[PDB]
Design a protein around this ligand. Structure first.
Ligand SMILES: NC[C@@]1(c2ccccc2)Cc2c(ccc(Cl)c2-c2ccccc2C(N)=O)O1
Ligand SMILES: *C(=O)CCCCCCCCCCCCC
Length: 209
């Protein structure tokens, strides 16, 4: 469970979809976080080098606080060609909060500690069972990401894929749109899954000392 005092990530999944015929659709999940155990900590200074720094960087974000909003997710992405591929590469996520506020989700793709792509999406709360729910449904992946996945899929060894992924990170920062107050920050780090049970993940809490 990834949750700060203000926002809670409910679900997250990056996937691809193909239309085998007009009545058949196939969906492969690269990564997934479905719907509270204690979390193991990771010192934030160990990841600084691979995230974007200076003005608006992760070090300035952490210093600004609150620290209860920072998390690290290690992903073991399933890049196995389990379906044949006009394919849709997308990302679906969902959050919840006790307060009604408009959120802003920014996704920073980084290569060698330098921001290459950024995507900003404002999300409005929807009242549901006494809580506020934010839904991002089938947000298409940018061609940078689709091409990156194709390039990784073309490497002959999984160790080669993991070496490229050593200098690739995605930083997700959710802020209250109007106040600009940090609600949730999730640093995503990746490896290619070698498991027979597919995509795996591990959550950690980002700490300083
Ligand atoms: N293959 C190693 C790893 C990994 C391993 C398994 C699953 C996902 C990723 C660790 C890792 C990356 C990429 C970027 C970072 Cl920032 C990290 C990382 C994570 C925690 C602390 C320090 C660092 C670091 N700076 O290396 O790939
Ligand atoms: C906008 O393009 C944000 C895209 C975030 C994609 C999540 C990455 C999931 C695919 C796993 C491939 C291996 C590591 C990128």
């Amino acid at each position: 469970t990834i949750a700060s005092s203000r926002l809670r990530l409910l679900e997250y999944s990056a996937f691809m979809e193909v239309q085998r015929d007009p009545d058949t659709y196939s969906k492969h999940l690269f990564v997934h976080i479905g719907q509270d155990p204690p979390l193991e900590a990771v010192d934030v200074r160990q990841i600084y080098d691979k995230f974007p720094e200076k003005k608006g960087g992760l070090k300035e974000l952490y210093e600004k606080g609150p620290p209860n909003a920072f998390f690290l997710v290690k992903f073991w992405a399933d890049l196995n060609s389990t379906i044949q591929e006009g394919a849709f590469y997308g990302v679906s996520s969902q959050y919840s909060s006790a307060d009604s506020m408009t959120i802003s989700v920014s996704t920073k793709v980084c290569s060698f500690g330098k921001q290459v792509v950024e995507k900003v999406e404002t999300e409005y709360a929807r009242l549901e069972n006494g809580r506020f729910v934010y839904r991002i449904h089938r947000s298409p992946m940018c061609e940078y990401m689709i091409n990156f996945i194709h390039k990784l899929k073309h490497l002959p060894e999984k160790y080669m894929m993991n070496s490229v992924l050593e200098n690739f990170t995605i930083l997700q920062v959710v802020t209250s749109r109007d106040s600009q107050e940090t609600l949730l920050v999730i640093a995503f780090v990746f490896e290619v899954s070698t498991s027979e049970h597919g995509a795996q993940h591990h959550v950690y809490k980002l700490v300083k000392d």
